Write a protein that binds this ligand. Sequence first.
Ligand SMILES: *[C@@H]1O[C@H](CO)[C@@H](O[C@@H]2O[C@H](CO)[C@@H](O[C@@H]3O[C@H](CO[C@H]4O[C@H](CO[C@H]5O[C@H](CO)[C@@H](O)[C@H](O)[C@@H]5O)[C@@H](O)[C@H](O)[C@@H]4O)[C@@H](O)[C@H](O[C@H]4O[C@H](CO)[C@@H](O)[C@H](O)[C@@H]4O[C@H]4O[C@H](CO)[C@@H](O)[C@H](O)[C@@H]4O)[C@@H]3O)[C@H](O)[C@H]2NC(C)=O)[C@H](O)[C@H]1NC(C)=O
Ligand SMILES: *[C@@H]1O[C@H](CO)[C@@H](O[C@@H]2O[C@H](CO)[C@@H](O[C@@H]3O[C@H](CO[C@H]4O[C@H](CO)[C@@H](O)[C@H](O)[C@@H]4O)[C@@H](O)[C@H](O)[C@@H]3O)[C@H](O)[C@H]2NC(C)=O)[C@H](O)[C@H]1NC(C)=O
Ligand SMILES: *[C@@H]1O[C@H](CO)[C@@H](O[C@@H]2O[C@H](CO)[C@@H](O[C@@H]3O[C@H](CO)[C@@H](O)[C@H](O)[C@@H]3O)[C@H](O)[C@H]2NC(C)=O)[C@H](O)[C@H]1NC(C)=O
Ligand SMILES: *[C@@H]1O[C@H](CO)[C@@H](O[C@@H]2O[C@H](CO)[C@@H](O[C@@H]3O[C@H](CO)[C@@H](O)[C@H](O)[C@@H]3O)[C@H](O)[C@H]2NC(C)=O)[C@H](O)[C@H]1NC(C)=O
Ligand SMILES: *[C@@H]1O[C@H](CO)[C@@H](O[C@@H]2O[C@H](CO)[C@@H](O)[C@H](O)[C@H]2NC(C)=O)[C@H](O)[C@H]1NC(C)=O
Ligand SMILES: *[C@@H]1O[C@H](CO)[C@@H](O[C@@H]2O[C@H](CO)[C@@H](O)[C@H](O)[C@H]2NC(C)=O)[C@H](O)[C@H]1NC(C)=O
Ligand SMILES: *[C@@H]1O[C@H](CO)[C@@H](O[C@@H]2O[C@H](CO)[C@@H](O)[C@H](O)[C@H]2NC(C)=O)[C@H](O)[C@H]1NC(C)=O
Ligand SMILES: *[C@@H]1O[C@H](CO)[C@@H](O[C@@H]2O[C@H](CO)[C@@H](O)[C@H](O)[C@H]2NC(C)=O)[C@H](O)[C@H]1NC(C)=O
Ligand SMILES: *[C@@H]1O[C@H](CO)[C@@H](O[C@@H]2O[C@H](CO)[C@@H](O)[C@H](O)[C@H]2NC(C)=O)[C@H](O)[C@H]1NC(C)=O
Ligand SMILES: *[C@@H]1O[C@H](CO)[C@@H](O[C@@H]2O[C@H](CO)[C@@H](O)[C@H](O)[C@H]2NC(C)=O)[C@H](O)[C@H]1NC(C)=O
Ligand SMILES: *[C@@H]1O[C@H](CO)[C@@H](O[C@@H]2O[C@H](CO)[C@@H](O)[C@H](O)[C@H]2NC(C)=O)[C@H](O)[C@H]1NC(C)=O
Ligand SMILES: *[C@@H]1O[C@H](CO)[C@@H](O[C@@H]2O[C@H](CO)[C@@H](O)[C@H](O)[C@H]2NC(C)=O)[C@H](O)[C@H]1NC(C)=O
Ligand SMILES: *[C@@H]1O[C@H](CO)[C@@H](O[C@@H]2O[C@H](CO)[C@@H](O)[C@H](O)[C@H]2NC(C)=O)[C@H](O)[C@H]1NC(C)=O
Ligand SMILES: *[C@@H]1O[C@H](CO)[C@@H](O[C@@H]2O[C@H](CO)[C@@H](O)[C@H](O)[C@H]2NC(C)=O)[C@H](O)[C@H]1NC(C)=O
Ligand SMILES: *[C@@H]1O[C@H](CO)[C@@H](O)[C@H](O)[C@H]1NC(C)=O
Ligand SMILES: *[C@@H]1O[C@H](CO)[C@@H](O)[C@H](O)[C@H]1NC(C)=O
Ligand SMILES: *[C@@H]1O[C@H](CO)[C@@H](O)[C@H](O)[C@H]1NC(C)=O
Ligand SMILES: *[C@@H]1O[C@H](CO)[C@@H](O)[C@H](O)[C@H]1NC(C)=O
Ligand SMILES: *[C@@H]1O[C@H](CO)[C@@H](O)[C@H](O)[C@H]1NC(C)=O
Lengths: 118, 118, 118, 434
Amino acid sequence: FLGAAGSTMGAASMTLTVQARNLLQLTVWGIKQLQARVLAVERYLKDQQLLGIWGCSGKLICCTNVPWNSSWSNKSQDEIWDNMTWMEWDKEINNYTDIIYSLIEESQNQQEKNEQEL
Amino acid sequence: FLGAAGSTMGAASMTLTVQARNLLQLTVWGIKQLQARVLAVERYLKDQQLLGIWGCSGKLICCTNVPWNSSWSNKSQDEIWDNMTWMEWDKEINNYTDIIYSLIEESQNQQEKNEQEL
Amino acid sequence: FLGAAGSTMGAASMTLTVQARNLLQLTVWGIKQLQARVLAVERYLKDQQLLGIWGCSGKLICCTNVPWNSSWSNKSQDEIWDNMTWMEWDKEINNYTDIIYSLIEESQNQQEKNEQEL
Amino acid sequence: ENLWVTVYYGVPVWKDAETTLFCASDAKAYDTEKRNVWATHCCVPTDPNPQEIVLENVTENFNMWKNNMVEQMHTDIISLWDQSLKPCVKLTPLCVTLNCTDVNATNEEIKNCSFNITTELRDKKKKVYALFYKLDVVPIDDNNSYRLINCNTSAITQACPKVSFEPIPIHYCAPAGFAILKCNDKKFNGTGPCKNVSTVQCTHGIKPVVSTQLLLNGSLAEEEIIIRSENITNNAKTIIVQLNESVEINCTRPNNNTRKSIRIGPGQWFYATGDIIGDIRQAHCNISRTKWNKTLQQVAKKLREHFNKTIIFNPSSGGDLEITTHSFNCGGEFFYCNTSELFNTNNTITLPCRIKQIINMWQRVGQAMYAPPIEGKIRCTSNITGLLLTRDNNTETFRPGGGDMRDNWRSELYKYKVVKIEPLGVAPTRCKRR
Ligand SMILES: *[C@@H]1O[C@H](CO)[C@@H](O[C@@H]2O[C@H](CO)[C@@H](O[C@@H]3O[C@H](CO[C@H]4O[C@H](CO[C@H]5O[C@H](CO)[C@@H](O)[C@H](O)[C@@H]5O)[C@@H](O)[C@H](O)[C@@H]4O)[C@@H](O)[C@H](O[C@H]4O[C@H](CO)[C@@H](O)[C@H](O)[C@@H]4O[C@H]4O[C@H](CO)[C@@H](O)[C@H](O)[C@@H]4O)[C@@H]3O)[C@H](O)[C@H]2NC(C)=O)[C@H](O)[C@H]1NC(C)=O
Ligand SMILES: *[C@@H]1O[C@H](CO)[C@@H](O[C@@H]2O[C@H](CO)[C@@H](O[C@@H]3O[C@H](CO[C@H]4O[C@H](CO)[C@@H](O)[C@H](O)[C@@H]4O)[C@@H](O)[C@H](O)[C@@H]3O)[C@H](O)[C@H]2NC(C)=O)[C@H](O)[C@H]1NC(C)=O
Ligand SMILES: *[C@@H]1O[C@H](CO)[C@@H](O[C@@H]2O[C@H](CO)[C@@H](O[C@@H]3O[C@H](CO)[C@@H](O)[C@H](O)[C@@H]3O)[C@H](O)[C@H]2NC(C)=O)[C@H](O)[C@H]1NC(C)=O
Ligand SMILES: *[C@@H]1O[C@H](CO)[C@@H](O[C@@H]2O[C@H](CO)[C@@H](O[C@@H]3O[C@H](CO)[C@@H](O)[C@H](O)[C@@H]3O)[C@H](O)[C@H]2NC(C)=O)[C@H](O)[C@H]1NC(C)=O
Ligand SMILES: *[C@@H]1O[C@H](CO)[C@@H](O[C@@H]2O[C@H](CO)[C@@H](O)[C@H](O)[C@H]2NC(C)=O)[C@H](O)[C@H]1NC(C)=O
Ligand SMILES: *[C@@H]1O[C@H](CO)[C@@H](O[C@@H]2O[C@H](CO)[C@@H](O)[C@H](O)[C@H]2NC(C)=O)[C@H](O)[C@H]1NC(C)=O
Ligand SMILES: *[C@@H]1O[C@H](CO)[C@@H](O[C@@H]2O[C@H](CO)[C@@H](O)[C@H](O)[C@H]2NC(C)=O)[C@H](O)[C@H]1NC(C)=O
Ligand SMILES: *[C@@H]1O[C@H](CO)[C@@H](O[C@@H]2O[C@H](CO)[C@@H](O)[C@H](O)[C@H]2NC(C)=O)[C@H](O)[C@H]1NC(C)=O
Ligand SMILES: *[C@@H]1O[C@H](CO)[C@@H](O[C@@H]2O[C@H](CO)[C@@H](O)[C@H](O)[C@H]2NC(C)=O)[C@H](O)[C@H]1NC(C)=O
Ligand SMILES: *[C@@H]1O[C@H](CO)[C@@H](O[C@@H]2O[C@H](CO)[C@@H](O)[C@H](O)[C@H]2NC(C)=O)[C@H](O)[C@H]1NC(C)=O
Ligand SMILES: *[C@@H]1O[C@H](CO)[C@@H](O[C@@H]2O[C@H](CO)[C@@H](O)[C@H](O)[C@H]2NC(C)=O)[C@H](O)[C@H]1NC(C)=O
Ligand SMILES: *[C@@H]1O[C@H](CO)[C@@H](O[C@@H]2O[C@H](CO)[C@@H](O)[C@H](O)[C@H]2NC(C)=O)[C@H](O)[C@H]1NC(C)=O
Ligand SMILES: *[C@@H]1O[C@H](CO)[C@@H](O[C@@H]2O[C@H](CO)[C@@H](O)[C@H](O)[C@H]2NC(C)=O)[C@H](O)[C@H]1NC(C)=O
Ligand SMILES: *[C@@H]1O[C@H](CO)[C@@H](O[C@@H]2O[C@H](CO)[C@@H](O)[C@H](O)[C@H]2NC(C)=O)[C@H](O)[C@H]1NC(C)=O
Ligand SMILES: *[C@@H]1O[C@H](CO)[C@@H](O)[C@H](O)[C@H]1NC(C)=O
Ligand SMILES: *[C@@H]1O[C@H](CO)[C@@H](O)[C@H](O)[C@H]1NC(C)=O
Ligand SMILES: *[C@@H]1O[C@H](CO)[C@@H](O)[C@H](O)[C@H]1NC(C)=O
Ligand SMILES: *[C@@H]1O[C@H](CO)[C@@H](O)[C@H](O)[C@H]1NC(C)=O
Ligand SMILES: *[C@@H]1O[C@H](CO)[C@@H](O)[C@H](O)[C@H]1NC(C)=O
């Protein structure tokens, strides 16, 4: 768990099942823990719902449509997958998180579901 | 959200990703809300479980086996998808909701899973 | 529900959709039931998460990699699927439950996700 | 022969488990005036057309003595009573010197007592009277000066005058993911395998009847008297005897009581026994002599099969009234009947009974309740469906047991077990992923 945090992005792909696995009286002492349990479930479901929307429900590694912007990253893979860690990467992309997600939901889903019926 | 409620059934198919997206102290003031959160999760999971049974877990549009009965609907698609709205449609099918669902669970699941192992 | 408990393992495969379907004021009287509801959800999600990891999320019958050990069972199918019930079977495998699950998880995911991107 | 691992989900198997069960009832025929504690309006209706599935070719080990359904039922009942009494009037203002004389039942057990009670206006007290049963009042002096028995230990909560405590059959039902197994072997006794096993959503309705020597209104054995014990050779254990035939008991409270409402504060009312109208007579219970005689002899005969000694019965050895007498509730009144005439022609056995209002239920000394009087007369009809017996030679002696209420529930829940479903499992096939 987070053993790969200092590893490069490529190497860290072998721990995706580790990081993704530990996500699951009338007194305040107890009610606050019940609330925590409900929240853990809600956070879990929100990530699963989002992956479902993107067509990534069965995948830890999920290729989608939407090419990369030079405004998001101008690095070669020689640096991104081999030298950088995921923390370092998140620190550079961060500002574009919402942008990228909208571009998948509004594309990958609509342009596959209508086409599949047709 | 429900912007498509007045739209025809076909047009409304573009908003399936919208309608499906907003589904997620020791005082009564707060306990009733904790209970509401638990219920929202339970309703969400029941719909997801049912889609899984029908083989529709990854789809917003899911074709299944089971042909239509003239007792369910005798309209052409010229009216159903192009003039009628989903509210109007639900008002005509309603009585057959349980019938159609049973016919998918008892067919689409059993006749695909045994065959896939074989 | 458990009607197939006395049936053989093969016959019982027709009820997988049955067994898998029924899984979903301030006072102790009420708080204990709220806690029970939260637990039912947590148990449900843990089984679904595990099936997802194994690549079995959409299936009631899921073939995986990992061959059988004679140390687990040296019984022929002539008895396993045609004469034995699932309770009887669980009583013979039990000790290897964690072993098999570990082998599926650590093989089936890593050997598919990378191969699919590549 | 190259078999591969295949995962199956929805496998019909189970493991023993302990979980939270819920209250369910058959009828919603109960109104909101009665407020029966077992019609809480927080208890759900059960299935009017319940299913039961017979499991063929299965064996299941049942154990009534280690059964956790019993502990849960016990806990729910204690909790229910404490909650029901929570908002009602406290009688701590009555712990005052009582000036008591005998009632005019003259030429026994009822005392006419005077109190000094603070009225709604704190500057004034009023002198008032109430009648009390002797069992509720302890002398302070050798003079006519008395105290209520609880002031020495605990505060009293007055039972809510509008709340019924009449038993209503309750079904204990499993939560999602769980199931209840039922043993259908007619002769199933204590612990061991049951061959005829079935699955239900829930238990039959069980009436939460409280009694200490004779079990009342339960379910009868199908063919013969069944004797159940954890360890039949351990004299410290209760032996639960289930009868295959009921014996009726007719109980009454023959004097006509009246109720006197005494204000003890700003909306705080105390209900006192007022004057007795008509004759003053003793409470009692009626058991047919012939039915009792054959029943007790059959119990001795069946007990003999486990001891091979001549079996006799004796009256209880001593303790407080809850253990020495047949304690039971009827009509909301609390009776303590003397059973020395049972554990010993064509007449009726009439057992004298005493009645008391200050109660410490389930041995919870420190939490007293006051049972307000009921106007008019009381008539009860009940069935003896079993006995709670203990043991001390070429003979053996049995005596009434009881006191600990869990023994009265083991007698109904002995047939049930809670298991959880574990639907995920593995079996061999030549089918492989690719
Ligand atoms: C083992 O099982 C047995 C069998 O169930 C248990 O024995 C039962 O115990 C019950 C509770 O003690 C007892 O019920 C009381 O019976 C009294 C006598 O009733 C006679 O008249 C009725 C007439 O019936 C018709 O009217 C009623 C009115 O509701 C309808 O409901 C019926 O459907 C009929 O339409 C006969 O049916 C009986 O057979 C008798 O002849 C009743 O008076 C008493 O009711 C009063 O007390 C109630 C307390 O909860 C209260 O809710 C109700 O409203 C009444 O109270 C009014 O009157 C009093 C008078 O002082 C007043 O103070 C109140 O303010 C209010 O105005 C109950 O109905 C069962 O009859 C009895 N069964 C038998 C066969 O004896 C046994 O207890 C159990 N064992 C143990 C250990 O628990
Ligand atoms: C226990 O003692 C109680 C008190 O004495 C008994 O109550 C009494 O019972 C008798 C017999 O039924 C009643 O007599 C009848 O009364 C009605 C009229 O009643 C109405 O008018 C009176 C006037 O005082 C009023 O008090 C009542 O509340 C009514 O408004 C007549 O029409 C009949 O013919 C007959 O006379 C008494 O009235 C009644 N008293 C009270 C105060 O209710 C009770 O029955 C005894 N219980 C037992 C089991 O013996
Ligand atoms: C239940 O009822 C029985 C009677 O059926 C009660 O037993 C009787 O209790 C009285 C108590 O005063 C005994 O009287 C005393 O007996 C001793 C004997 O040595 C004597 O020395 C005393 O002077 C006095 O007479 C009476 O004998 C006894 N009856 C029998 C047959 O033993 C019993 O106490 C009642 N129990 C309850 C819990 O109410
Ligand atoms: C105490 O035990 C006796 C039996 O020893 C119980 O008496 C039995 O009660 C049942 C009701 O649960 C009666 O069954 C039904 O009675 C109705 C009456 O109209 C009838 O129409 C139905 O066809 C059916 O027979 C049963 O006959 C009756 N047995 C006798 C011999 O009367 C009694 O209810 C138990 N409880 C109490 C408090 O007495
Ligand atoms: C922390 O950084 C150091 C320095 O880069 C990593 O150690 C070497 O990294 C280079 C990168 O190409 C490898 O070629 C070397 O083989 C690594 N050294 C060794 C001894 O293997 C170090 O591994 C980084 N930390 C983590 C967790 O990877
Ligand atoms: C409400 O009904 C009106 C009337 O049908 C819809 O307006 C027209 O619908 C016809 C149907 O074939 C179209 O061909 C026209 O082009 C629509 N009018 C316009 C100006 O586009 C109206 O759109 C319906 N409401 C909604 C939300 O669709
Ligand atoms: C319980 O075991 C019995 C005995 O095997 C089962 O009954 C027979 O099982 C054989 C097994 O090959 C079948 O060929 C027979 O046809 C079965 N008998 C009948 C009348 O069909 C019985 O079915 C088992 N219980 C369950 C629930 O299957
Ligand atoms: C085994 O137990 C089952 C109940 O689980 C018994 O089946 C009941 O038999 C009676 C007989 O008249 C029927 O009225 C019930 O409707 C049956 N119940 C169910 C659920 O089928 C069965 O008879 C018992 N067998 C033995 C040998 O005791
Ligand atoms: C209440 O207490 C008093 C004395 O403690 C009891 O005795 C009465 O005392 C008064 C004092 O003046 C006398 O006038 C009365 O005549 C006494 N009564 C009798 C019968 O002699 C009184 O009896 C007690 N009351 C109760 C209900 O116990
Ligand atoms: C409280 O109780 C006491 C006695 O227990 C009452 O005192 C008696 O009051 C009467 C009134 O005439 C006197 O005649 C007695 O002599 C008093 N007894 C004693 C021992 O002095 C007292 O009055 C009661 N308080 C109230 C408010 O009634
Ligand atoms: C106050 O409570 C104590 C116990 O908490 C009582 O002591 C015993 O009470 C029982 C009850 O019948 C008697 O049989 C014992 O003989 C009592 N002990 C002694 C040493 O006598 C005490 O008696 C209670 N107060 C009063 C006034 O009785
Ligand atoms: C019902 O009673 C029988 C005895 O008639 C119990 O038999 C068991 O026998 C073995 C033999 O060594 C003893 O070790 C056990 O202790 C006995 N069990 C008990 C509970 O004493 C049988 O187990 C009893 N219960 C059931 C459900 O069959
Ligand atoms: C019932 O419990 C009693 C408890 O003592 C067991 O009997 C005795 O157990 C002690 C344990 O040290 C032995 O030393 C004694 O020799 C035992 N007594 C006899 C007569 O053997 C008793 O065995 C238990 N019975 C069952 C059926 O479990
Ligand atoms: C208990 O009370 C019941 C009635 O409440 C008695 O049953 C009556 O018995 C007589 C005997 O001849 C019959 O004639 C009546 O018809 C019965 N009544 C009913 C309603 O059936 C019963 O006998 C009493 N038991 C005792 C021990 O006295
Ligand atoms: C990059 O950002 C610009 C901003 O206008 C946008 O027009 C272009 O389409 C984006 N490229 C990608 C790959 O989304
Ligand atoms: C239509 O309903 C009838 C009712 O008997 C049924 O027999 C027929 O198979 C149904 N058709 C479809 C498409 O289910
Ligand atoms: C069976 O267990 C042995 C234990 O060493 C292991 O080496 C072998 O690979 C196992 N076989 C299978 C099919 O996993
Ligand atoms: C059980 O009750 C029935 C009622 O007819 C009786 O015949 C049978 O003998 C009783 N059982 C025993 C052991 O006496
Ligand atoms: C009841 O037990 C007492 C014990 O002393 C005995 O003397 C009396 O005769 C017994 N009564 C009957 C009816 O056996």
